[PDB]
């Protein structure tokens, strides 16, 4: 029966116009327009928000059926249902009390897109333009009591401040240029001696709470007023006067007891409470926030947390919500969210170029998640920052209201400008900007933005280069140019800087479309996209591959996650990552690069528990220089750990297994150590493995087992040490002995020379081990083109190589040492012994291994190289005798049969 008498809830019908003229239509607040069904149809000659640069939609002859009324389909970011990029005009009649006459009255809008003007009865207010922050009007004198019209003109229109096309504050990569109001909305009476705001400051090791209250006094004269502050049983009041407007008062309350500190494994939280009576009125506002006590801070050049070292295992938060577009306000949305996080192993958000509504902070205060925040700007491309620009002042008073609003949450570790700035006097605006915020407010870590600059004023680094994956790198990284390995890490990169750092958005690497995730999408955006790629891949003869495009590339994706997280732990000292990403980015040309989908939901070929054996507060590091051994060869690696658990692990063993596909164990030892400390570069122990008792061509699984955390790794064991010329032929090129020992009925393996493909065969493919980089929409091509291979074990040319469906690290050598086969151009029936999946932009039928018959005769094509280095090619020469034992064996039928001619479009002069 209790109710909440001093706001009025303002959320429901509002009167809706686009011109302030016609007022037929009534539109839902909570909502934007698009969430109404309310703009235009989406056309070709949309004004978008974002950038766009793989233009091939609006010009390639593939796009065109694309471009016709009534079947628009985007292939760059997910298609919102409507389109409005304007003034929008919102009406709604209130009912003011009598008892609100001469009070404190203010308005309170969640979150508006962009730029919002408040009328009362026609009556311009004035003006608010926050995009990461609420929207706050003072009507205090400026509304009476009785029947009022309030109306609200939202403009969502890029106009003296450009943050930056890209930024995903107004972006339609993901969150979209919306229009509307979102989030709570009220109208909130108080006392004419209340409270506006509270700075609460903490102190951990001083056992004290601090707090800065901003009052008003609503009077003409002095006020006599009585404050009171409470934490849990210890209270403090005192009596004071307060001049006429606002007043700063300042306070202290000492801490009697132990106080429970606030991070990732105890996120213990306080409650405030602060009220000021009025001693004429008797009257008394109440103000209620959470809090934590927590320090996270640079001691020695190392991140701390309470005097704890800390290490950030993070990913990017992007404002993708695609079933409504606008960011949720509830908190059980980000619960979600960073519940799966945390199911991944993760402790840290950072929030790429905005700012989330207050859920996501109060969320992830009762989780112990660390949040980085950015102030709605992605200064580039379209603006630029610290050249005297609107967005200059726009950006101090940006991270003003960001502070003020959200800056008591303890998970507000660390906050920049945006991410990856422009501008040649940037450098000097940022550096003004973290010095200053350095000094205003120490309850966080500043940095200058997202990727670079690297001033020395920061106090942690956000640089890209400690990564696998670098932009233009190609096939020249080191996942893509050199053998599998695990003894790799950037310590010698950020050991030349006295600063602490930041990997900037790790991994990027791609999985094939999920079309089953098509139906999750009944909201704002739809993923006209994947109808586009599910549409051509349909063409291409090959719908049926769409689950095992999924399954075999994500397998591909997870393991270059591992490679690029196992890397960076295995950093000594590293201040952290951020994985770019856990979830698929919809923008961007579709940057499909997490394993869980636009929804922070799973996919199907990683589960979170496995996920989390390499990414935890407590992970287990093998370092071995290859992964392809011989029965004669002995396994030399080393054991480490990255330990930053709450208190040093008391464990001094460490087991480890080397076990068979069936379980079978070939061998196991048990490694002695010092109990481990908070740390990285902990070392567990020696291995030394001799493979002299492992029989066959073996997959084996080495797993390292430290207290309650175990971590595996996967090595290849092949014999140390079929063919007869007359039997099987081997050749490079369909030449005269070729061709004649086909039209003899007889057996030839072809084999290209690495390079040797012509365009027209696949040539323009250009292959490698690793998943595409981002999309090769956004980077216009960069390598590799392709997403893993899909095999089946069970066929007998496969029968001496050890191989699950999918690519793993044993098929380095084939996608390194090959070029990709356009089998269509062939025999468009041709159904590969290996195939290779391509880029969904292009669906194009790719094969390393296939056979057909010519006349008599039986021809096994393979793309790979065979020829070169095979004495350092241990894992290929046990491919070519999987081939060779096949060929000569009694199960080498082919079944498409081709012409001689059909053929010659492999070699070119
Ligand atoms: O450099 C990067 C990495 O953030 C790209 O986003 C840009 O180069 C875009 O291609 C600019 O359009
Ligand atoms: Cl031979
Ligand atoms: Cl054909």
Not at 44 to 53: A, C, E, K, L
Not at 550 to 572: F, H, N, V
């Amino acid at each position: 029966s209790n109710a909440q008498t001093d706001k009025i809830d303002l959320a429901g019908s509002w009167t809706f116009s686009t011109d302030s003229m016609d007022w037929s239509r009534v539109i839902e607040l909570p909502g934007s327009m698009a969430s109404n069904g309310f703009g235009e149809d989406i056309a070709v000659g949309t004004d978008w928000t974002g950038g766009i640069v793989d233009s091939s939609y609006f010009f390639k002859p593939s796009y065109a059926k694309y471009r016709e009324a009534g079947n628009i389909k985007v292939p760059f970011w997910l298609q919102p249902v409507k389109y409005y990029k304007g003034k929008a005009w919102y009406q709604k009649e209130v009912v003011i009390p009598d008892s609100w006459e001469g009070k404190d009255i203010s308005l309170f809008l969640e979150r508006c897109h962009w730029e919002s003007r408040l009328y009362i009865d026609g009556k311009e207010i004035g003006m608010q333009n926050a995009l990461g922050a609420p929207h706050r009007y003072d009507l205090t004198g400026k509304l009476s009591a009785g029947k009022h019209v309030l109306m609200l003109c939202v403009d969502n229109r890029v106009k003296n401040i450009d943050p930056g096309e890209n930024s995903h504050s107004i972006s339609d990569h993901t969150q979209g240029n919306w229009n509307g109001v979102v989030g709570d909305m009220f109208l909130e009476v108080k006392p004419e001696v209340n409270v506006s705001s509270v700075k609460i400051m903490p102190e951990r090791l001083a056992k004290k709470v601090s707090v800065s209250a901003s009052l008003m006094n609503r009077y003409e004269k002095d006020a006599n007023v009585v404050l009171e502050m409470t934490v849990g049983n210890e209270k403090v009041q005192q009596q004071c006067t307060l001049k006429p407007g606002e007043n700063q008062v300042m306070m202290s309350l000492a801490m009697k007891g132990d106080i429970k500190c606030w991070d990732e494994f105890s996120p213990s939280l306080y409650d405030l409470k602060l009220s000021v009576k009025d001693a004429d009125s008797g009257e008394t506002d109440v103000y209620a926030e959470r809090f934590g006590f927590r320090d996270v801070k640079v001691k020695d050049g190392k991140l701390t947390i309470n005097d704890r070292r800390l290490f950030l295992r993070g990913t990017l938060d992007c404002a993708v919500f695609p079933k409504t577009g606008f960011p949720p306000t509830d908190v059980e949305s980000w619960k979600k969210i960073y519940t799966t996080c945390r199911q991944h192993g993760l402790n840290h958000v950072r929030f790429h170029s905005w700012c989330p509504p207050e859920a996501a902070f109060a969320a992830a205060d009762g989780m112990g998640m660390y949040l980085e925040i950015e102030c709605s700007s992605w200064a580039n491309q379209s603006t630029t920052i610290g050249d005297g620009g609107d967005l200059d002042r726009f950006i101090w008073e940006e991270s003003e209201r960001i502070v003020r609003e959200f800056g008591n949450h303890p998970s507000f570790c660390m906050m920049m400008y945006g991410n990856e700035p422009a501008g040649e006097g940037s450098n000097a605006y940022l550096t003004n900007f973290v010095t200053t915020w350095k000094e205003r407010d120490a309850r966080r870590l500043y940095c200058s933005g997202a990727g670079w600059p690297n001033l020395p004023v920061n106090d942690f680094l956000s640089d890209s280069n400690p990564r696998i994956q670098a932009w233009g790198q190609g096939v020249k990284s080191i996942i893509n140019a050199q053998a599998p390995r695990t003894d790799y890490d950037w310590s010698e990169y950020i050991g030349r800087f006295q600063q602490p750092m930041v990997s900037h958005e790790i991994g990027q690497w791609c999985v094939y479309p999920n079309f089953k995730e098509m139906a999750k999408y009944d909201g704002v955006m739809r993923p006209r996209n994947f109808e586009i790629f599910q549409e051509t891949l349909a063409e291409n003869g090959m719908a049926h591959l769409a689950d095992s495009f999924l399954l075999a590339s994500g397998k591909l994706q997870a393991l270059c996650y591992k490679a690029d997280i196992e890397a960076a732990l295995r950093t000594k000292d590293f201040g952290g990552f951020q994985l770019l990403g856990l979830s698929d980015f919809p923008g961007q040309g579709t940057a499909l690069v997490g394993v869980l989908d636009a929804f922070w939901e799973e996919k199907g070929y990683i589960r979170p528990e496995e996920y989390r054996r390499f990414c935890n507060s407590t992970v287990p590091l093998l370092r071995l220089p290859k992964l392809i051994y011989t029965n004669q060869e002995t396994v030399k690696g080393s054991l480490e750990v990255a330990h930053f658990g709450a208190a040093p692990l008391e464990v001094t063993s460490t087991v480890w297994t080397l076990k068979t596909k069936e379980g079978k164990t070939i061998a196991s030892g048990t490694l002695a150590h010092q109990p481990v400390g908070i740390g990285n570069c902990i070392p567990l122990g020696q291995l030394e493995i001799p493979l002299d008792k492992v029989d066959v061509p073996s997959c084996l699984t080495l797993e390292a087992t430290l207290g309650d955390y175990a971590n595996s790794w996967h090595i290849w064991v092949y014999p140390a040490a079929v063919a007869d010329e007359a039997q099987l032929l081997m050749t490079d090129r369909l030449d005269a002995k070729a061709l004649q020992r086909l039209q003899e009925g007889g057996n030839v393996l072809l084999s290209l020379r690495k390079g040797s493909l012509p365009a027209e065969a696949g040539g323009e493919v250009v292959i490698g081990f690793s998943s595409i980089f981002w999309n090769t929409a956004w980077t216009l091509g960069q390598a590799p083109h392709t997403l893993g291979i899909l095999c089946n074990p069970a066929h007998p040319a496969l029968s001496e190589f050890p191989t699950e469906y999918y690519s793993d690290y044993q098929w380095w050598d084939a996608m390194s040492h090959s070029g990709a086969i356009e089998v269509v151009k062939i025999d468009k029936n041709l159904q590969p012994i290996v195939r290779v999946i391509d880029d969904w932009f292009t669906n194009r039928p790719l094969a390393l291994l296939f056979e057909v018959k010519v006349g008599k005769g039986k021809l096994l094509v393979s793309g790979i190289d065979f020829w070169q280095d095979m004495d350092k090619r241990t894992e290929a020469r046990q491919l070519l005798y999987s081939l060779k034992k096949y060929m000569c064996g009694n199960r080498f039928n082919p079944s498409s049969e081709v012409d001689a001619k059909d053929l010659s479009i492999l070699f070119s002069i």
